[PDB]
Amino acid sequence: ADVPAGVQLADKQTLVRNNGSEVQSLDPHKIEGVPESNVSRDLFEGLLISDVEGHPSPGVAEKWENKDFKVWTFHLRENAKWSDGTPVTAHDFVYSWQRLADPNTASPYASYLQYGHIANIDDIIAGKKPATDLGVKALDDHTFEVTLSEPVPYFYKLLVHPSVSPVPKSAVEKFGDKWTQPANIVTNGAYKLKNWVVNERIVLERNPQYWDNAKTVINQVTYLPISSEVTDVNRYRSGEIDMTYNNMPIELFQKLKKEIPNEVRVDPYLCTYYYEINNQKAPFNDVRVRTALKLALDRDIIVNKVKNQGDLPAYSYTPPYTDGAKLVEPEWFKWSQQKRNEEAKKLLAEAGFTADKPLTFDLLYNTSDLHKKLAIAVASIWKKNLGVNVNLENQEWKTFLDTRHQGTFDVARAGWCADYNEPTSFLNTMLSDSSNNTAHYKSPAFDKLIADTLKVADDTQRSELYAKAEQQLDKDSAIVPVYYYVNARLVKPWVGGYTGKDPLDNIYVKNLYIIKH
Numbered sequence: 001a002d003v004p005a006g007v008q009l010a011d012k013q014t015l016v017r018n019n020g021s022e023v024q025s026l027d028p029h030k031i032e033g034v035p036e037s038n039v040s041r042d043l044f045e046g047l048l049i050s051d052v053e054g055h056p057s058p059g060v061a062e063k064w065e066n067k068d069f070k071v072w073t074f075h076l077r078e079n080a081k082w083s084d085g086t087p088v089t090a091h092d093f094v095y096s097w098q099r100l101a102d103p104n105t106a107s108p109y110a111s112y113l114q115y116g117h118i119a120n121i122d123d124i125i126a127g128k129k130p131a132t133d134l135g136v137k138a139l140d141d142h143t144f145e146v147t148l149s150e151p152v153p154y155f156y157k158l159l160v161h162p163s164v165s166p167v168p169k170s171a172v173e174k175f176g177d178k179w180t181q182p183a184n185i186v187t188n189g190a191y192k193l194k195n196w197v198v199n200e201r202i203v204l205e206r207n208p209q210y211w212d213n214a215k216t217v218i219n220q221v222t223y224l225p226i227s228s229e230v231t232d233v234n235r236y237r238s239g240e241i242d243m244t245y246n247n248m249p250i251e252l253f254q255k256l257k258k259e260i261p262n263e264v265r266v267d268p269y270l271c272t273y274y275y276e277i278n279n280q281k282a283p284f285n286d287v288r289v290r291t292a293l294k295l296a297l298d299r300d301i302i303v304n305k306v307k308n309q310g311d312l313p314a315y316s317y318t319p320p321y322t323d324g325a326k327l328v329e330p331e332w333f334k335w336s337q338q339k340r341n342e343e344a345k346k347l348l349a350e351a352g353f354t355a356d357k358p359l360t361f362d363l364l365y366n367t368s369d370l371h372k373k374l375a376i377a378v379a380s381i382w383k384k385n386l387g388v389n390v391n392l393e394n395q396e397w398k399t400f401l402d403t404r405h406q407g408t409f410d411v412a413r414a415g416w417c418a419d420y421n422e423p424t425s426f427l428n429t430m431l432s433d434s435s436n437n438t439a440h441y442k443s444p445a446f447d448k449l450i451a452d453t454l455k456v457a458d459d460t461q462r463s464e465l466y467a468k469a470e471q472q473l474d475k476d477s478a479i480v481p482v483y484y485y486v487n488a489r490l491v492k493p494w495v496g497g498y499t500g501k502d503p504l505d506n507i508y509v510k511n512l513y514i515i516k517h
Contacts (some may be wrong), residue, residue, distance in 0.1 A: 001217045001438040001497050001513045002052075009217070016079070017509075018232040018245040019223040021366070021397035022199050026180040028165045029100050032108040032401065032436070034417060034505075035245075037162045039223050042191040042204050042509050044165035047074050047093070047144070048156060054421075054502025056157050058171035060088050060166070061144070069151035076142040082168060082188045082210040090138030090164040099172075100163055102131040108405065109163035112419070112437040116158050116429045117148045117454070125433075148509035150454045157420040159441035160506060168185035190216045190510035199225055204509070217513040227367045229353070236490050239374045243498070246489035246505065250373045252446065253309050253488075262493060266310050270319045270421065273311070275363070275378065275480040276414035278407060279441040288347040289359065290477035293411070294500070296386040297378060298337050303483045306377045310488065314481035316470045318426040320502075321484070325423050326463045328473050339383045348386060365413035366400040374482075375413060404438035414438070415485070418504055423466040424450065430473060441478045493517070 003009065020035045031037065041049075045216060049059040061074035080088035100107050101124040113121040119135025135147035148155065158164065168186040171179040178184055182193045190212070191204035202223040206216055224241065228248035233256065235241045246269075248256075256264055275293070277284050284290060299313035315333040332340060342474045353359040363379065365371040372394065373496050379390040390411075404412055418425040419484050429436035432447050449469040453462045473479070487505050491498055497512040 001215060001511045003217065003496065003513055007496060008388050008516040012517045013217055013219045013514050015218045015221040015243070015495070015509060015512060015514070016241050017221060017224050017243045018236070018241055019202070019225055019490035020225070020245040020247060021227045022225040023202070023223075024186070024398050024401065025457055026193065026196070027177075028162045029105050029107045029165055030111075031162060033397065035223075035225075035397065038507070039202055040162040040165065041189065042221065043161065043185075043187040043189045043193065044167070044304075045088075045189040045445065046159055047076075048159040049162050049508065050502055050504065050506035052497060052502070052508075054504055054506060056160060056420075059159075061219055064156065066155070069153045069155065070148045070211075072146045072148070073139070074144045074146070074153060076144065077211060078142060080188065080210045081211060082186050083192045083207050083209050084186050085209050087141070088166060088188050089141040090144035091141065092168070093144045094136050094138050094170045096166045097136050097164060098131040098134050101125065101134050101165060103127055107163065108401075111159075111428070111431075111433070112158070112161060112163045113449050114431075114434075114473070115152055115424060116146075116155055117152055119147045119149050125435075151457065152454060154420070154422045157422060158196040159398055160504075161419045179366070190508065191221065194220070201225075208405075210510075212510070216510045218509050221509045229369045233490060242488045242492045246487050247368065247370050248309055248488045249369045250307065251369065256490065260490070263490050265288075265487070265489055265491050265498065265500050267487045268321065268503050269417070269485045269505060270322055270425075270503045271415055271485040272314055272317055272319055272426070273413075273415050273482040273485055274314070274317065276404070276412045276439050277477070277479060278409050278411070279476075279478060280407060281410065281440075282358070283351065283451065284410060286351055286362075287477055288351040289353075290480075292344040292345075292348045292351070292386055293382065293388070294477045294480045295332060295340040295347075296382055296388075297480055297482065298340075298381050298385065299336065299482065301381060302374060302377060307374065307483070310486040311483035312486075314483050315474070316481055317430070317473055317479060318423045318470055319418075319484045320464065322418065322423050322426070323421040324459070324463055325466060327467050327470050330471070337385075344386050348388075353387075355387065358387055358389055359411040362392070362393055363390045363411050363413070364393045364395065364400065364403060364409050367394045371413050401438075407440055412438075413479075414479070417485075422504065423463075424453065427466060427469050430469075430478065439478055441473075441476070443472060443476060443478075446472045446476075 033124035047061040051057040062077040192207040194205040195203035232244040432442040494515040494517040
């Protein structure tokens with residue numbers, strides 16, 4: 001942390017953060033969510049990290065170069081160490097990205113190496129080539145070189161993501177899936193794992209071996225797994241919680257706005273809230289059905305009347321304020337709701353849905369006040385605007401992700417947040433073979449538009465193809481865009497260092513500090 005001149009610090013430097021839910025795991029190769037990444041950033045540090053405002057900055061790599069945006073050489077700082085005191089080296093990285101590529105890891109983020117276009121990743125995911133063939137090599141203990149199959153100018157921006165964080169081979173190999181237990185884990189970020197009580201708390205303690213330890217100020221941070229936004233606000237206002245999770249409850253937000261204005265942080269956020277449709281299951285494999293639901297959902301009601309927390313009605317997957325996005329707002333978004341509603345009902349009648357045999361299906365969401373309340377209004381809206389019947393189902397975060405990967409669903413509440421600030425961070429997740437593709441959407445035309453983005457060396461060219469890829473996605477009604485999020489959470493007046501300027505919300509506890517109160 002960079003403490004401002006003259007701020008007086010508290011004696012006690014401890015932080016309690018709500019984290020939305022029980023993390024799927026602490027293994028960087030086994031995770032895919034915001035809660036998983038919150039804790040990962042404090043424990044495992046990659047090549048680059050986001051600074052306090054989100055800019056890609058030095059992590060384990062102190063400086064790097066590229067040759068034609070295809071061969072990237074990372075110079076690793078020499079004092080980078082793990083919590084057992086042993087050096088962090090380029091060999092750590094080679095082993096880790098290899099472990100991520102390997103199909104026997106079954107990482108949900110295995111496709112991240114495709115997104116970066118590391119050489120040979122497609123045959124490695126496919127089983128055609130062993131993982132040791134990945135285009136990565138340690139030139140020496142402090143020099144890691146990456147070779148891509150094509151120029152990727154924004155490549156280094158991908159490197160702040162948890163999936164490309166180093167994992168310590170000797171803990172993984174001797175303890176298997178128990179490597180992340182506190183007695184077995186070894187970490188290289190600012191913190192170390194002190195305690196892990198499933199559905200109770202995760203307690204991190206400062207890691208003295210961390211290379212930038214001298215600037216770390218919080219000595220201990222606890223991550224809570226509270227999925228009730230009401231309860232998180234409640235324990236924040238009671239004094240137990242210092243920073244809530246950034247999901248706000250409908251029951252209390254307006255009141256909070258009026259009661260504690262200074263503590264309500266409302267900032268730009270590159271996430272999109274959508275109802276993810278299972279594109280390979282009947283009757284959702286019929287574009288008419290999918291378009292009816294997209295059009296009959298009333299964004300003005302959901303976003304401005306029922307949520308009203310500063311979100312913006314959405315008409316696409318990629319957020320339009322993403323760096324490099326110049327999106328075409330479709331015609332249906334400008335229509336009246338009644339015109340959307342008529343159109344939606346017409347397509348369903350063409351799909352053969354009658355009043356005697358209505359369209360009835362499930363709507364899966366992750367346990368949450370916010371999502372339950374939005375789910376009930378959507379159900380109602382869809383019921384009165386289109387005549388469809390919806391059955392609401394909640395699941396704990398972990399089970400919920402796993403249901404969506406399984407394809408054991410109809411429609412599911414979803415949210416995708418950028419991993420790096422560029423449109424492919426969203427668009428790559430819809431590629432036919434993406435490991436992130438829980439929509440189970442396969443469009444050859446969609447795939448080709450995105451494959452062409454790196455065959456041109458023009459920004460305008462590349463934004464126009466992103467724009468066309470969003471239109472293809474909208475043409476197929478792959479999803480139901482609801483709103484672009486804002487980052488809204490409560491932060492105690494004494495928490496210094498949360499600027500609200502990173503649009504990915506990549507917060508590190510090593511950059512925070514408690515002001516004396």
